[PDB]
Amino acid sequence: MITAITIMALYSIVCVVGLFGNFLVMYVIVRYTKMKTATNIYIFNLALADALATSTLPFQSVNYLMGTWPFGTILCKIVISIDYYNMFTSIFTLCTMSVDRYIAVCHPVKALDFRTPRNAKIINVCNWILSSAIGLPVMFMATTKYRQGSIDCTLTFSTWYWENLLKICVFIFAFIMPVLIITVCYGLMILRLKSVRLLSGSREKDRNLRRITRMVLVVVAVFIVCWTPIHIYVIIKALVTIPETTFQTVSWHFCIALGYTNSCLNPVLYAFLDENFKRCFREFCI
Ligand SMILES: CCn1cc(CN2[C@H]3C=C(c4cccc(O)c4)[C@](C)(C[C@@H]3C(=O)OC)[C@H]2C)cn1
Numbered sequence: 041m042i043t044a045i046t047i048m049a050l051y052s053i054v055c056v057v058g059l060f061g062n063f064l065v066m067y068v069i070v071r072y073t074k075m076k077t078a079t080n081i082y083i084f085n086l087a088l089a090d091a092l093a094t095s096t097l098p099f100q101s102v103n104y105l106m107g108t109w110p111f112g113t114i115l116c117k118i119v120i121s122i123d124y125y126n127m128f129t130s131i132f133t134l135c136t137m138s139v140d141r142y143i144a145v146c147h148p149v150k151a152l153d154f155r156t157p158r159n160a161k162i163i164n165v166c167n168w169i170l171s172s173a174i175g176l177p178v179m180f181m182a183t184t185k186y187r188q189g190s191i192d193c194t195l196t197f198s199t200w201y202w203e204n205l206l207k208i209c210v211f212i213f214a215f216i217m218p219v220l221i222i223t224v225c226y227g228l229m230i231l232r233l234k235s236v237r238l239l240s241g242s243r244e245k246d247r248n249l250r251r252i253t254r255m256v257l258v259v260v261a262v263f264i265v266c267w268t269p270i271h272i273y274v275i276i277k278a279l280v281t282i283p284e285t286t287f288q289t290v291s292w293h294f295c296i297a298l299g300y301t302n303s304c305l306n307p308v309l310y311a312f313l314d315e316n317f318k319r320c321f322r323e324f325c326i
Pocket residue numbers: 093100123124126127206207210270271274275295296297299300
């Protein structure tokens with residue numbers, strides 16, 4: 041009741057803040073060509089995915105007060121497909137961003153040649169295709185169930201096998217592989233930063249490189265912190281059939297809320313970790 045309305049209020053606050061912040065990030069990235077760097081290309085996709093995953097929160101939150109789904113199965117389809125597209129889009133974007141830094145640092149000669157913004161958009165597109173390859177089935181099997189109590193929105197499968205096959209294809213192809221690629225790149229960029237006195241030659245350029253890479257790593261770590269709980273809980277709850285409990289329900293709600301709040305946390309990180317973003321957030325906001 042009171043607790044439920046506080047949960048709804050928190051979800052509404054997260055919805056508004058995340059949508060506004062991610063819209064602002066997309067606009068600031070699109071505003072100027074000097075802000076169209078390769079890192080900004082992937083930041084654009086990350087913010088786009090966050091905005092898409094946040095736009096459905098009013099529907100996802102109104103349900104707590106009714107136990108019913110009046111919005112429609114089409115909207116149910118879209119919301120359920122968004123919930124899955126978000127994980128793949130964002131993690132793949134971060135993996136591509138962390139791989140790009142390796143080309144920038146350890147192979148600067150070919151870095152500028154292969155990191156054109158057209159190539160960045162191409163690796164954004166490929167991320168989209170690979171995510172769609174496991175996202176489209178979610179929408180194609182997502183439909184509402186006309187329960188006796190109240191209509192509900194849920195997935196369907198033909199259902200103990202594929203329901204877990206999708207979970208494995210997420211935990212493997214969308215968490216562990218991208219994390220393992222990010223680590224494999226960073227473990228070598230970090231050594232190339234120290235073993236090389238100056239990377240880009242120009243001291244200002246080297247400082248900009250070591251700072252943009254730090255922001256990329258910070259965003260990557262923020263995403264990992266925010267999303268590891270939900271992935272791990274999703275895997276474990278199915279693995280050991282954890283039964284219903286007060287602590288279990290609270291932890292589930294907290295994990296989902298943190299995963300959704302990452303979307304509105306990203307704007308804070310961009311504001312607190314980049315001179316360009318910080319200046320623009322006041323420039324367009326005044
Ligand atoms: C508040 C509305 N709500 C959402 C849910 C469930 N969601 C949460 C977690 C999921 C998930 C995460 C990891 C692995 C996996 O296989 C599935 C979703 C795909 C994404 C949702 C989320 O939090 O990321 C924005 C979906 C099933 C239940 N209620």
